[PDB]
Curated annotation (Swiss-Prot), chain A:
GO CC terms: Cul2-RING ubiquitin ligase complex; Cul3-RING ubiquitin ligase complex; Cul4-RING E3 ubiquitin ligase complex; Cul4A-RING E3 ubiquitin ligase complex; Cul4B-RING E3 ubiquitin ligase complex; Cul5-RING ubiquitin ligase complex; Cul7-RING ubiquitin ligase complex; cullin-RING ubiquitin ligase complex
GO biological process terms held by the UniProt record: cellular response to amino acid stimulus; cellular response to chemical stress; cellular response to oxidative stress; cellular response to UV; DNA damage response; MAPK cascade; negative regulation of canonical Wnt signaling pathway; negative regulation of insulin receptor signaling pathway
Residue spans crossing the bilayer: none
Protein name in UniProt: E3 ubiquitin-protein ligase RBX1
Keywords, ordered alphabetically: Acetylation, Cytoplasm, DNA damage, DNA repair, Host-virus interaction, Metal-binding, Nucleus, Phosphoprotein, Transferase, Ubl conjugation pathway, Zinc, Zinc-finger
GO molecular function, one term: ubiquitin protein ligase binding
Family of the protein in this entry: Belongs to the RING-box family.
Protein source organism: Homo sapiens (Human)
Sites where the protein binds Zn(2+) 3: C56, H58, C75, D78
Residues noted as binding Zn(2+) 2 in the record, renumbered to the chain: C34, C37, C49, H63
Reaction(s) the record says it catalyses: S-ubiquitinyl-[E2 ubiquitin-conjugating enzyme]-L-cysteine + [acceptor protein]-L-lysine = [E2 ubiquitin-conjugating enzyme]-L-cysteine + N(6)-ubiquitinyl-[acceptor protein]-L-lysine; S-[NEDD8-protein]-yl-[E2 NEDD8-conjugating enzyme]-L-cysteine + [cullin]-L-lysine = [E2 NEDD8-conjugating enzyme]-L-cysteine + N(6)-[NEDD8-protein]-yl-[cullin]-L-lysine
Residues annotated as binding Zn(2+) 1: C23, C26, H61, C64
Tissue specificity: Widely expressed.
From Swiss-Prot, chain B:
Top-level lineage group: Eukaryota
Tissue: Brain, spermatozoa, and testis (at protein level). Widely expressed.
Gene designation per UniProt: CUL3
Protein name: Cullin-3
Subunit structure: Forms neddylation-dependent homodimers. Component of multiple BCR (BTB-CUL3-RBX1) E3 ubiquitin-protein ligase complexes formed of CUL3, RBX1 and a variable BTB domain-containing protein acting as both, adapter to cullin and substrate recognition subunit. The BCR complex may be active as a heterodimeric complex, in which NEDD8, covalently attached to one CUL3 molecule, binds to the C-terminus of a second CUL3 molecule. Interacts with RBX1, RNF7, CYCE and TIP120A/CAND1. Part of the BCR(SPOP) containing SPOP, and of BCR containing homodimeric SPOPL or the heterodimer formed by SPOP and SPOPL.
Species name: Homo sapiens
Coiled coil feature spans: none
Miscellaneous information on this protein: High-glucose conditions in renal tubular epithelial cells lead to up-regulation of CUL3 expression, significant increase in CUL3-mediated ubiquitination of MRPL12 and dysregulation of mitochondrial biosynthesis.
């Protein structure tokens, strides 16, 4: 051949079993609102109902784990202190 | 006792029903309460050990946290 690849420097991103189809706290989805918001509008009045990403690569609705912080303080699928490293998908 | 062991194995292999911890704790408490009014504990322990062997010598990462709860409940019961 005329051109051949010798080295590769790909970067691999990983995500845990967040179950994009069932929120691990509310069991609706990784998007499309939550149990306490339901309808899309539901008198939104600004604020937000996006996805929250932790330091453990877990994803839930911001509302779900914001409320869950009052019940416990360690991400339910593990035993790690939950951070708020990202907001939204 | 064998059927109780099978039920606890089915509940422990995967928490697809009751993803959160509160209902899991309640159902485990109910199961151990039911086991309290039971005799012939030797066969129960034998079948529980067999289920442990089946669930540990197969695909891992079943619960990874509920084992401590199970051993604590067995200690207390
Ligand atoms: Zn949710
Ligand atoms: Zn919401
Ligand atoms: Zn986590």
């Amino acid at each position: 051949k005329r051109f051949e690849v010798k080295k590769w420097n790909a970067v691999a991103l990983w995500a845990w079993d967040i179950v994009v189809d069932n929120c691990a706290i509310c069991r609706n989805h990784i998007m499309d609102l939550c149990i306490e918001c339901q309808a899309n509008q539901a008198s939104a009045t600004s604020e937000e109902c996006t996805v929250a990403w932790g330091v453990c690569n877990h994803a839930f609705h911001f509302h779900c784990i914001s409320r869950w912080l009052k019940t416990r303080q360690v991400c339910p699928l593990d035993n790690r202190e939950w951070e708020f490293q990202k907001y939204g998908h | 006792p064998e059927y109780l062991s099978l039920f606890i194995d089915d509940k422990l292999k995967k928490g697809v029903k009751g993803l959160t911890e509160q209902e899991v704790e309640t159902i485990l408490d109910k199961a151990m309460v039911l086991f309290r009014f039971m005799q012939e504990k030797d066969v129960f322990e034998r079948y529980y050990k067999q289920h442990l062997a089946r669930r540990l010598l197969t695909n891992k990462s079943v619960s990874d946290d509920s084992e401590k709860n199970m051993i604590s409940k067995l200690k207390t019961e």
